[PDB]
């Protein structure tokens, strides 16, 4: 399958006292492997997957230095943007940044990205071609002119097409026993009477990885969305994911309904039907 | 801020069985801004040893966090998650239901 | 592996 390496950064200003809160997390696919939190005691990038622990001190020192440099950039940006938007010094603001790279099933570079938001709104982002920027407003346009003159896109493109995928490949090999295996959903259907005349069927998908999944209900082999409920895919806390979907049906007609489960770990989709 | 109120799910890691150790999860998502207070409750008392994930966010920039604790369900004990955020006039309490 | 030199906005 295809794979991704992504880094997510959040900085939130603290007008009352001190410097911004800064939180950085790194993922391979849906697996968190590192974190940095400015409030944590270590002041180091920290491992969050066993496979990254085999990297040596020079890796950890370099990642700590770089992550701190990201924190400082975000601090400066919170000040600059407060000025660009004519905002008071009294309020707390937020910057969010995400970037990363994907490789295809062929293990070659597939795409890169780099996106930045201010106060939860798009600010500036690299276009798919990795050569130009999308600026949402005149403040971001000013940033775009700066970055164009500094050849920021050229340097990022070199990282995204080169370094980023080389390291993603390295992590994929070192973490292979988890990162290159799929956990197919463990599925189950429950039944509840909700009145004298209706029942709710709930289709469960448990313990799956990666998080992407499709759960759909069919009545007599046609997709049904009315009278259904879906929850957001949620983390189990052990590295896997959970989801369910439910449908209300006339009592006695349960057998007309099937729940269809599609996942990377399932070579053919699963179909569940209430009979017993 | 534009402001987005959190979605909240309360659930066990494993199917719940009385007397068997498990984890109680409260997944908060879809919120902005990031400052959020989340407690897990046993018969309304705050649970002290609660852990949480590192802040991250989704495609729309909204935040998500998982709060969790080890616990052993029993027939008597009620569990819940209490959440406060700038979008809520007072804290929201969501009780744990075993098949949700 | 992080990118080494984030430029200010």
Residue numbers in the entry:
A (entry chain A): 1 to 276
B (entry chain B): 0 to 99
C (entry chain C): 1 to 9
Give excerpts from the publication:
subsequently eluted from HLA-A*0201 molecules on melanoma cells. context of HLA-A*0201, present in 49% of Caucasian individuals. important tumor antigen, targeted by many clinical therapies.
unligated structures of A2-YLE, A2-YLE-3A, and A2-YLE-5A. mutation of glycine 5 into an alanine. contacting the central part of the gp100280–288 peptide. YLE-5A peptide ligands, even at higher peptide concentrations.
